[PDB]
Amino acid sequence: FHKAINRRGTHSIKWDTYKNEELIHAWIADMDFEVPKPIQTALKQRIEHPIFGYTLPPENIGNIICNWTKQQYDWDIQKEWIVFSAGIVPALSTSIQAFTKENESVLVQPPIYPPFFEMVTTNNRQLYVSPLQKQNDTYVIDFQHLEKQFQQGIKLMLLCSPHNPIGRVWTKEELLQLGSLCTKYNVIVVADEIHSDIIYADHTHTPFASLSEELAARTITCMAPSKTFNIAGLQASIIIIPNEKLRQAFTSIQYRQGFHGLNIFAYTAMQSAYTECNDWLNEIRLYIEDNAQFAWEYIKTHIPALSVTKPEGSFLLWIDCSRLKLSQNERTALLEEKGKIIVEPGEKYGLGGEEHIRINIGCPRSVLEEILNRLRHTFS
Amino acid sequence: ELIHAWIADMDFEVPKPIQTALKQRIEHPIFGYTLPPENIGNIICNWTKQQYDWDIQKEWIVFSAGIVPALSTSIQAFTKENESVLVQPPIYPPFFEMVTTNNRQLYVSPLQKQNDTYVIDFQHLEKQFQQGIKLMLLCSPHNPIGRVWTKEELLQLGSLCTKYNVIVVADEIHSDIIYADHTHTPFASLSEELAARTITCMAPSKTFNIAGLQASIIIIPNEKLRQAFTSIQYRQGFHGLNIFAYTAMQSAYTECNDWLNEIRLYIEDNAQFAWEYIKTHIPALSVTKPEGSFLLWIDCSRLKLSQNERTALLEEKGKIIVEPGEKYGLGGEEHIRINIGCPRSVLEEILNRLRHTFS
Numbered sequence: 216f217h218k219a220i221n222r223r224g225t226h227s228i229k230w231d232t233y234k235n236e237e238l239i240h241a242w243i244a245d246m247d248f249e250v251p252k253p254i255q256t257a258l259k260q261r262i263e264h265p266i267f268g269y270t271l272p273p274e275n276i277g278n279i280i281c282n283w284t285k286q287q288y289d290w291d292i293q294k295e296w297i298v299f300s301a302g303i304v305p306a307l308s309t310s311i312q313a314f315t316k317e318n319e320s321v322l323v324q325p326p327i328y329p330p331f332f333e334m335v336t337t338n339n340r341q342l343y344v345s346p347l348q349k350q351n352d353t354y355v356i357d358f359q360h361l362e363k364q365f366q367q368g369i370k371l372m373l374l375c376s377p378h379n380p381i382g383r384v385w386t387k388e389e390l391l392q393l394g395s396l397c398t399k400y401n402v403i404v405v406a407d408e409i410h411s412d413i414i415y416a417d418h419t420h421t422p423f424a425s426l427s428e429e430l431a432a433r434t435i436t437c438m439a440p441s442k443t444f445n446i447a448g449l450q451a452s453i454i455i456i457p458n459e460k461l462r463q464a465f466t467s468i469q470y471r472q473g474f475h476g477l478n479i480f481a482y483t484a485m486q487s488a489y490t491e492c493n494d495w496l497n498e499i500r501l502y503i504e505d506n507a508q509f510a511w512e513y514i515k516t517h518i519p520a521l522s523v524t525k526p527e528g529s530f531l532l533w534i535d536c537s538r539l540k541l542s543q544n545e546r547t548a549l550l551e552e553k554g555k556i557i558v559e560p561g562e563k564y565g566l567g568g569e570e571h572i573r574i575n576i577g578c579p580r581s582v583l584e585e586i587l588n589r590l591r592h593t594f595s
Numbered sequence: 596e597l598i599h600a601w602i603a604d605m606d607f608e609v610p611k612p613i614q615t616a617l618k619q620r621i622e623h624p625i626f627g628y629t630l631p632p633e634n635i636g637n638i639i640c641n642w643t644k645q646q647y648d649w650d651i652q653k654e655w656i657v658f659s660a661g662i663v664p665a666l667s668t669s670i671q672a673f674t675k676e677n678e679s680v681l682v683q684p685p686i687y688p689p690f691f692e693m694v695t696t697n698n699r700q701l702y703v704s705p706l707q708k709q710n711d712t713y714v715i716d717f718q719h720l721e722k723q724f725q726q727g728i729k730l731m732l733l734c735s736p737h738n739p740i741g742r743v744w745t746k747e748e749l750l751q752l753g754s755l756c757t758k759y760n761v762i763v764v765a766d767e768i769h770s771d772i773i774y775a776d777h778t779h780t781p782f783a784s785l786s787e788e789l790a791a792r793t794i795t796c797m798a799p800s801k802t803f804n805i806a807g808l809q810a811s812i813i814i815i816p817n818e819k820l821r822q823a824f825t826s827i828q829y830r831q832g833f834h835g836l837n838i839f840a841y842t843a844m845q846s847a848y849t850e851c852n853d854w855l856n857e858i859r860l861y862i863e864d865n866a867q868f869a870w871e872y873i874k875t876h877i878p879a880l881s882v883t884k885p886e887g888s889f890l891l892w893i894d895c896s897r898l899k900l901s902q903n904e905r906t907a908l909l910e911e912k913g914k915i916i917v918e919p920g921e922k923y924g925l926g927g928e929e930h931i932r933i934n935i936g937c938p939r940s941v942l943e944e945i946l947n948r949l950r951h952t953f954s
């Protein structure tokens with residue numbers, strides 16, 4: 216992970232959307248790390264059988280996924296709970312159409328990954344928010360506010376765990392308190408756990424559906440190798456739905472939308488990601504966590520005008536620019552014109568995103584060093 | 596062992612340039628979020644000119660991860676719940692499924708078998724249109740009968756769609772496998788008026804045996820129809836194609852013209868061979884003469900077997916599973932479809948097993 220690899224001219228959204236060669240790109244959430252070599256090998260092998268017609272899932276894929284949830288989170292699942300989706304944003308949309316009617320209520324907790332909002336409002340459901348509470352280097356759930364929203368008749372809650380963009384890995388105690396509110400008010404939960412496998416040394420990912428049979432009965436769990444293994448462009452996702460009635464409604468929507476399984480390389484890459492890549496995974500968790508610690512230290516020492524939220528997992532870094540007292544336009548201009556860095560503006564993540572930025576730390580230390588140098592320069 | 600003649604794809608190796616472009620992309624060992632290839636609009640514009648003499652704009656092109664999703668998106672974009680969608684059986688069963696699973700009303704205008712071909716019944720179709728059809732699904736070339744519609748047939752269809760204000764989804768997935776005596780005419784190519792009411796679904800999937808990579812192109816000249824379609828895609832969470840769909844598409848539509856010319860000759864020779872073999876050795880069957888694709892539609896009605904007796908006889912006595920016709924709707928009863936997109940040796944084996952089955 217130490218050596219920079221050129222992504223210019225690979226049709227990378229991150230690196231090939233802006234033509235200006237002096238810009239460094241740390242916005243969209245993929246990594247400037249090479250994929251594990253066993254995934255490259257598995258792909259090379261499949262290309263050596265030069266027919267690419269309709270394919271079913273590999274015969275062992277269910278067992279591979281069952282062993283993955285058991286190994287990673289000590290979660291025992293059934294093969295029949297597994298549904299595929301070509302990405303997690305489609306699974307959010309499928310869930311909204313499956314478990315709510317038009318003008319019924321869906322709750323999210325900003326600041327949040329923007330398709331959480333967009334998929335609710337574009338499907339003509341009513342959007343409710345329970346904004347997270349900034350507290351120190353971190354964020355908590357305001358359970359009193361959330362309960363007040365649940366009392367208004369919420370059908371569905373989209374949970375982000377770990378939460379993009381702030382990097383919170385929810386504790387077992389936080390998820391149980393959430394779980395008891397979902398039971399109390401009979402709320403169905405979509406648990407977007409796409410960030411579940413990049414977790415820092417002092418934290419543990421608890422699948423919400425793993426806490427009890429009661430919570431398994433009411434939860435749609437969204438996972439993937441996309442973020443973990445930098446294969447998002449292959450569109451491989453896994454939806455785990457323990458409740459046969461919820462699973463039948465979900466797969467009904469997929470069916471009426473003409474969905475009939477993943478592309479060939481999604482299955483090939485997922486098969487390798489979840490069997491042959493454990494060492495690469497251990498090493499990238501250590502590398503990314505050290506990157507997060509270096510970034511927090513660098514900003515604390517050299518850009519005291521900024522406040523960092525300490526991430527507990529994933530490779531995204533959430534930064535409060537409040538005390539610079541800049542307009543979004545003025546701050547973006549400085550970053551682009553003076554910094555020459557492209558980072559995510561926080562205002563797109565809804566309430567709590569005002570005057571924040573999100574920088575991608577899923578890159579070699581030497582690149583992160585340059586990003587942080589340019590960030591210091593930008594606000595000097 | 597069992598031959599699987601029901602499969603929807605060819606048993607031929609992908610053209611080498613597609614294998615080469617794939618191997619080349621895997622040299623760059625990052626598989627993150629990706630843009631369509633920069634030149635892709637120009638490559639597609641050039642394809643539709645090279646192949647069909649059809650002039651398109653770049654702005655008309657939308658991507659879809661398959662044609663059945665494009666059928667579903669079109670039904671959701673252009674009709675409301677409880678509005679009527681028309682198909683022409685016998686037809687690819689997903690044509691029906693995408694209407695009924697979306698709570699639209701199914702109408703049918705069954706095609707009429709004549710000699711060893713089929714025609715549209717324009718008198719019947721017009722009577723269905725008079726009942727207020729919103730959307731028609733046109734299959735061109737038509738699976739499973741292999742009809743390549745003539746410009747004159749499409750123009751007669753077009754006058755009706757103009758007269759009753761019917762929006763057309765043209766499923767043109769089989770558009771590149773056309774036999775020597777025929778030409779594919781995209782319905783949207785016929786005039787500005789018909790371009791303005793048509794969604795055209797094309798793909799390299801069937802042509803180049805890369806259906807597993809899920810690359811499709813949807814061409815929507817009418818800006819308001821195009822925006823309605825992409826709005827459905829957006830609310831379903833679709834962004835674009837997977838990396839290898841783009842890689843394989845770029846190459847299929849630029850570097851494989853000699854492979855395509857050659858496959859067209861081989862499949863038509865297979866079609867002619869199958870035709871003669873069945874005429875000579877199995878006179879209990881009648882066969883529709885295909886003009887395109889790699890599917891053969893066989894009438895088994897003179898044998899007077901139930902679907903179950905026929906299917907059993909084929910699997911037991913023939914060690915072959917075919918596509919059964921009944922699920923294709925009216926005109927599919929006591930028919931089978933067999934895939935002839937295979938090496939001649941496989942097809943000769945397939946035909947021996949049919950002859951032995953219905954001996």
Ligand SMILES: Cc1ncc(COP(=O)(O)O)c(C=O)c1O
Nearest residue numbers: 244302303304328379409441447
């Ligand atoms: C929380 C969350 N959900 C879903 C997604 C979508 O991922 P994909 O496009 O790989 O399915 C992302 C990607 O950034 C994400 O961070």
Ligand SMILES: Cc1ncc(COP(=O)(O)O)c(C=O)c1O
Nearest residue numbers: 603661662663664687738766768
């Ligand atoms: C007419 C027609 N449309 C569509 C398809 C396949 O659609 P998709 O691209 O969703 O696999 C086929 C393949 O059998 C076909 O014959």
